[model samples]
Target chain A: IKAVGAYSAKQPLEPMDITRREPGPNDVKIEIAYCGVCHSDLHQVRSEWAGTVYPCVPGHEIVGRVVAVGDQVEKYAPGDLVGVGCIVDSCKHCEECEDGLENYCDHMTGTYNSPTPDEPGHTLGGYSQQIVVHERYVLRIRHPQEQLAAVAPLLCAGITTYSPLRHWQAGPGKKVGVVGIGGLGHMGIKLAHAMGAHVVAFTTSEAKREAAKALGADEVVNSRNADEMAAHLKSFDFILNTVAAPHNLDDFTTLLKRDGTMTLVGAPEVFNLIMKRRAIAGSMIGGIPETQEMLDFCAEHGIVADIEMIRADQINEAYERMLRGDVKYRFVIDNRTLT
Target chain B: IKAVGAYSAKQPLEPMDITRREPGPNDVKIEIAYCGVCHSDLHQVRSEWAGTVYPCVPGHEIVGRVVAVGDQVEKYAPGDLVGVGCIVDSCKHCEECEDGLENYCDHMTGTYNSPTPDEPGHTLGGYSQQIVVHERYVLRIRHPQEQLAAVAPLLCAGITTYSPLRHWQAGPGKKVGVVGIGGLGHMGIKLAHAMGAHVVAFTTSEAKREAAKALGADEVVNSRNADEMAAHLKSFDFILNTVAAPHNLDDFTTLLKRDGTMTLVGAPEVFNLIMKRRAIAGSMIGGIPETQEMLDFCAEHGIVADIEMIRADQINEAYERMLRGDVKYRFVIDNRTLT
Candidate 1:
């Protein structure tokens, strides 16, 4: 199979050939159509977070059409439109797996750069032309074929925010704040609003006010303004912080009501949490069952990432553009360009 | 009233005369019997925490006999035994107060050094011979008369640990860990044990092993031992950290099961929490209603702090002793020596 990836940390991503394992008894082989470029993809490819395996092909949010199914695969056929998120496999016997929360499983395997016994000796992700995954890790995509590219980010950025919002019960009567209007934050604002919450968008840029409002935020506050930040003090029921880059966390933690929580998809002063009985909790990508539910809900609600489509060859430039915050919300690759 | 207090941050605590407000409507005046010394008392009195008012008298874990009641008071008679914890008053109509969680209220008033309308413009604490408080803030002490001195610590150390334990649902079949073996940690071990959770006590000193086991730890782990700490990876349902001293928090967050919480009654690296889907949350002292319940539960279970008795003049020496970790658990001031 042909894929685009970096051979070394110092070099740019280039065209490469990688081997794919034969579809197992429970496997579904999908011909990849699109993959969302996440901030983590750049981190792993550049070895910024360390432990980067060579020939690292980093893409987890995937959407495509099933090209083949193993003999024992019953849930999908050859023509099914499917998606795969961050997890590819996990220890099935653990309590987290038993409860369908494989994302928290200690033995959970990432879609890329994770060790495997395959021919390449490591899992290569959806920057490639195809992915063979177990049926349990595959999700059914209900949106039309044209919307498939936009739905790619849902598998990672979408569910990362959606899981915490739902877990913290962001719905009617809930005042939710979505910090940093980037890939994850934009989806957070949309999903929280669709869930009937009073959504507030927090961004350092005053330029994002109309942009955030257009994306479903009932209120937009430039987080840099002291007066604007002070107005919402102790008022939020939940805050979905999408900014992985460090900033002053106490600024947002102070906005939460007593017993309220700020779930990071991505420091926080300990005293900020202690004073109001507040919590700084973490949520990774959603569990398999919830991820499927999120997809269905998004399709029904007509929700998709506001994305800029890029080709496989342009990924290195896209990474630079993303660093500059130039993309509208997310950058999705047309996997057809891998050839 | 005769009391002992510090006139300045640099001065030693010495005997002084202070005025007490008359029992107002809905007030209960208590003749102080015993008061528990808390680590926070040391911080406030010495101005290590800043904002110390001059002539500051510090104590909150107060247990005494009610000697006077306002005309409008209904909960207690002059002869009744009562206790008062850290909180003295709160904005009664806030959401936190309405939910019986006045400890989280924004307008919460501390027992000492907080501004007040009465004498000297600041509230003096239980280090005095007598004190007056609103009936709403008074707790009925059900422990036997002989156990009153030991029960004094329950108002602070006991409730601080008990609140998070109960909130996080420590019970039968739950594996809970108590980090640190000092004032708050000792109570956490006992309360988690009384709640039927399998409790493990973590200590830095090997000398605390038998001592912690005697306080109801089912097992003791010297946290410095790498091999021993590894035995419980991803095994705990909840961990109650009572240590205020800064240390590596990642040491314990890895021990939690998926969705497990380590409630601080106390930073914690952000990655430690994100990786396992764990949370490091903070809980202050329990609410008034919960405080009363904790007292009742402790009395029924024959639980009391292992206390060392001290006089007003011994307080200065006791502070130094506490800094050296010399006390068995808590030091209770025999207020009869205030005169």
Candidate 2:
């Protein structure tokens, strides 16, 4: 396999020829098409998060077409379009996996940098030429082929936002708030809006006002502006806080109505403003079943990421740009350019 | 009205003669029988919480008989058994009040030390020989008269713990944990157990293990034992944390299962522990309807506080004893001793 990977935490990613495993009996081999650059990829490749292995190729928002399938694979065959997100495998019999929530399973295996018994002793993610995964981990993408790059982020960012929205029941008659105006927040606003909710996009400044409005937010509120935030006081049925940036939550805490709950989708593990029976909750990325539902729903609702396309070699620079919050939603890599 | 009143934040409480308000058309005057000593009383009379009115009389867990009723009051008559908890009044028209959640209403009036337009300049609490309240603020007591002193805590600590327990759905087949073994926690264990949950009482020391079990906790966990706490990881469905003490909450977060909620009832906030899809929430004392429901449920379940009764002169000593966590669970003042 031809792929870009880091030999060590301090090294810049460069071409590294590696051997991928053959398809297991329950596996489907995917020929990589496009891969989304997630903030986690930067964290993993730099060993910022825990347990990063050497020769690391980090990517999880994966999109591809099935090139081959093992005899026991019932879900896919040659030339079938497929996608895989953060999870590639898990202990199938645990309560979480049995309920299709691999993301929360105790033995969940990430697509990259997770302990694996294979040659490199760790899973190398979608930032590679091909991937052989169990059929159960595969998702069918319905959007047209041209939208593949934009659709790539939906596997991670999409599911990360979608699961909590659905889990919290963001739909008709619910006034929902989407905090932060970045990749996950942008998707949250669109998904909550498409789900028939009254979506209010919350940002720290007016800088992203029009951009947020373009994503179908029912209203845009500058969270930094007391007057703007006050207008929506005690009005939101739910708020999906997606900003990884730490914040003073009391501002949002007072925005919820009585018995209101605000969810941190894979974010803060942390409100008073319980002064009114308010709740602060957190959720991880979606389960495999719910992720598929999210993809299907996005297809039905004409939802796709507003993405900036980049060649594989620009990934190093993409990390810097991402850190500056410069991207107008997400960045996706053209997998073909890797070779 | 002869009351035990504190003249200043740090001063000792002494006998003070104050006039009770004349009952209005919808008001009820109660000849006080017993007043439960709550931790809030200490906080309020000592000005530990904000806005403590000078000469503050602090007690909210009040139980008595109706000695007088306004001409237009429809709910009660003279000589009826009644109780009053933390709330004195609320704006009847607000969404929170209309939804029967008066405890969350913005204009909700506390039983004591809140702003009032009447003669003493602030609300007077239950440490008096008599009190006049609107008919709406009075609750009917169903427990046998012998248990009235014990039932005094039900008006405050009981409702405070019960509201969150029921709101979080502690019931048969549910695994519930109550943190703390003091007044509120003792009541929490009793109520959650009576509500049919498998109750686990968490205390910092083994000293309270048997005491917590005596209060209806099916299981007692000395939270200081890391091995014991770790054994119950991802096990609780709902945890009603009655701890008014400030502390780190991550220890309890990992104990909850998927979709589980740990209500702080009052924290810097972290939900990272809910990475398995957990929530940390808060609840004030319940609304009028729920308070009534809790009282009724307690009556049917034969539940009441385990209290140590005190003369009004013993209040200063009681406060000191409560500070030392020496009360079996609560201290109820005999108002007749005020003279």
Candidate 3:
């Protein structure tokens, strides 16, 4: 399959006309239909996160239709709708992989800019017409066919928030706070609310208040307002911080009750954040088992991204809108436009 | 009973007369034989930490012969050697107190610089001839009589290090790091070594290297030496940091294994410490049950603080020497001088 991508670090992503190999015994061949743009993609494309290879196709929030399945791939049949997230493969024998947390495996192969077991160059991502993923890395899509484009972002943002929420037991009787109202936080608010928690959204922007509530936040607090933030201090059972920019972490850490945790899903290029006592913490992309669980949960709740669909030619424009925070949430590309 | 104390904050601790009331039903009157000088005592006496009261008798590492016991004090009898640590009382019904972690109880009463339950003045500490404490807060000292003076610090510093080491399961196959080589780190080295783990001491001073190793560090790494520090990266099973000064915490955090923790017994006055990935956690003093366990563990391993004995009148000079880090490890007040 020929794919579209960037030829250099600073250059705009364009049609690359690259090749993907045939599916293996444990592989699922996906005809990529929609790919959601992530902030990480911007970081990788601009080489902000380091290890950016030339001619990189940066997309990890991949939702597609399975065009082929190898003999050993019993979980999916041809034509089954599926998704692939940050990781596409890992050493299945490691403890992390055995525990269903393949994203944490030391040898985890990313959707892009990661070494492939078979290829000479780094692994290509979903910014193309098709991707050949190991069956274990593919997630089942239960959303309706019309919802596929909006559901693409869930492959990354949805499960990133969901993993920590579920790991920290953010459900009934838990007061969960989602910091930021961007792609990840939107999914966080929706998922935590659907999990039967009292969902609170922390945002500096007053304009996001109504949007947060519309996305299933039970309450919204302007984080820059001291009094409003203080009102919830020492009350929240858990806080999932989705803000990628470096900020004073103590602001949200002070909101947690005794023995409470706040997990970070956003990996900042420079992490100069301070944490105080009584706080448990870490960064995570979803585990393989939990990613599957998140997809099933999203499907059950009819939860999908609030997305704007764009043609393949509008990716540069979408990146600019994303950087300006002008999009309502996410931009998903329709793969058919690439042809 | 009369005791010696300081008359004002920052005043040289002199022989000012103070009195102890008769024991209540749950109390045991302890004739103070030895009291260990903790770093916190220096902080409180100088009002470095908040909420210092005047005429403070600053000591919590108390070891003594039980002179008398109230009618219902069943744990000890007259002439039995015992110890009292950081706390004297707490809200018995609280979850923290019920779980034997009175140090974290909301209504916890400190051994010094805290207002008494019934009296108008602040509570006096054990840098004196005699003191009375609740039997519940009293710990049995099983170490030999000669080790009693050295064992005084164990009541506070020993348990502070011991609780986290034990809680985090520092034992065989675990590589434990003890940060700083003063009072707390010395005890941490001994305890972690006795628990059957490989113990490493991290220090900035070359002068304390031999002493730290003598105290039972399997290895000593001068953290100032980058080559030495870098060798141990991502290797420690647990790190017990006893340094109270705010410095770059990332150096130690980077040394921890993926799920490993570094518990801080000393609270750096400035909360500028930032935690990466896993943690920078703080623990208060240990509870009664764990304190007793620490004492028994010390007795079993023939462990005691390397101490310099001082008379009551020499406290100011001792404080000066302590400030210069000239003391062997800890300064223990021989209360007979007060008598």
Candidate 4:
């Protein structure tokens, strides 16, 4: 199968060929239509975080059409519109898995670069022409086929922000803050708004003020402005912080009302929670059950990512622009160009 | 009223005289019997925390008998056993107070050294011979009179820990850890066990192993030992951290299972909480209703702090001993020695 992946940390993603296994019992073979490029893809190809297996093929925010399914598969059939996120497999019998929290399972498998029986001795991902996965990791996509390219990011960014909002009960009378106006934050703002919460979008740039409101934020605060930040002090029920770069998190924690929480969907430094009896928590991309729920909710609410499309050859340039925060929200690879 | 107070930030607390306000229509005058000495008292007297008011009469864990009640007070008469913890008054019209959570009220008056008309234009606490508080802040004590001295710490240390335990749902089939086996943590271990959770006590000293076990801990771990700490990874349903001194909280947050939380009863530095999707939260002493509930729960469980009884004259030495972590749980000043 044709693919785009890195040969080593120093090299850029280029044309390559990879193998997809024959579907086993309960497996579904998918012909990739669109795969959302994530920040982790850049990090993995460049070996930014520890333990990047090469040649690393990085793409987890995946939306595709099922071309085939094993005889034993119950959830998917050929021609089914489906999606797969960060997880590909997990110990099926663990309490977390059985309890529908596979994201927290002890031996959960990532969609890419995890140990596998394939050529690289590590699991390859959707940055390729075709892929095969167990039916349990496949999700049914109910959104219109024309929105498939935009639906790709919901597999990762959508679930990451949506899980925490629902867990913290963001709705109706709740005041929610979505920090950082990038990919994940855009989804957070929309999700909170759709859930009936008053959504406040926070960004370091005043330039994003109107852009955030355009994305469904009722109000936008330049977090660097003291008075603007203070106006919302002790006013939030939950704050979804998506800024990956570490900064003073106390700025967000202090905004939560009594018994309120600020959850980080990105990795951040440890910080205080003493004043006003607040809490700081972290959440990863969600489990299979919640992911499906998030997809359904997004479909019901007519929500999909605001995206810029790219052909396979433009991947490297897209990475550079994404680093500059130039994309409207997400970048998706049109897999038809992979061949 | 005779009291013990610090005349200046650098001075040792000495015998002093302070004035009490005439009981208001909603007031109850208490003849303080036992006042639990707390670490906050030391911090307040030395001006270690910001905005210390002197002559500061620092004591909030107060258990006493009502000597007088204002004419309009329908709840109590003289000689009723009562207690008061951290908060004395709040803007009763605020949402927090109306919801029975005055500890989070922005305008709450602390039992000592907070703006008030009761003593030198600041509130004087249980270190005095008598205290007059709004009836709403006074708690009913149901413990036996003989056990009341030991129950004094329950006013502060007991509820400080109990509120978080209950809020986080530490109960049967839950594995709870109480860190720092001192005044507040000793009570946390006891309360969590009484709540039917399996309690694991964490201490820096191996010497506290047996001491912690005797205080209702089903297991004790020397936190300095890596092997012991590793054995319990991802095991705790909730962890009540009672250490005020700054330390690496990541050690405890990583031990929490998925979606678990660690509640800070003592003020500590900001800590991270994302490793396992855990949360770090802070809780002050509980509200009046919850304080009363905790006291009744303690009485029913036959639980009380292990305390060393001291005369008012011995308080200076007790503070020094407390700084050295030498007190066996807590110290109670017998108010009879105040005069």
Q: Report the number of the highest-lDDT candidate.
A: 1
Interface RMSD (Å) of candidate 3: 9.3
* TM-score per candidate, chains pooled: 0.97, 0.95, 0.92, 0.97
Deviation (Å) of A295 in candidate 3: 1.7
User: In model 4, which regions exceed 4 Å deviation?
Assistant: A267-272, B268-272
lDDT of each: 0.91, 0.87, 0.82, 0.88
Measured with DockQ on alpha carbons, how good is candidate 4? 0.53
DockQ of each: 0.69, 0.60, 0.33, 0.53
Interface RMSD of each: 1.4, 2.9, 9.3, 4.0
- lDDT order of candidates, top first: 1, 4, 2, 3
TM-score of chain B of each: 0.98, 0.97, 0.94, 0.97
Q: Which of 1 and 2 is the better model by TM-score?
A: 1
Q: What is the per-residue lDDT of model 4 for residues A227-252, given as tens digits with 9 covering 90 to 100?
A: 99999888898899998774768778
As a TM-score, model 1 comes out at 0.97
What lDDT is obtained when candidate 3 is compared to the true structure?
0.82
**lDDT of candidate 1 vs native?**
0.91
The model with the greater DockQ, 3 or 4, is 4
Clashes of each: 0, 6, 0, 3
Please give the lDDT score for candidate 2.
0.87
Candidate 2: tens digits of C-alpha lDDT, residues A203-306: 88788999899999989998888899888888888989988864868788888887788888634222354677778888778889998998888888789999
Residue-by-residue lDDT tens digits, candidate 1, A1-339: 899999889989999999899999999999999999999899888866568988889999999999999999999999999999999999999878999888987788899988898867888999999999999999999998989999999999999998999999999999999998888889999899999999999989888899999999999999899999999999999998888874778899999998898888861677888888888878888889999999999999899999999999999999999888888899999999887
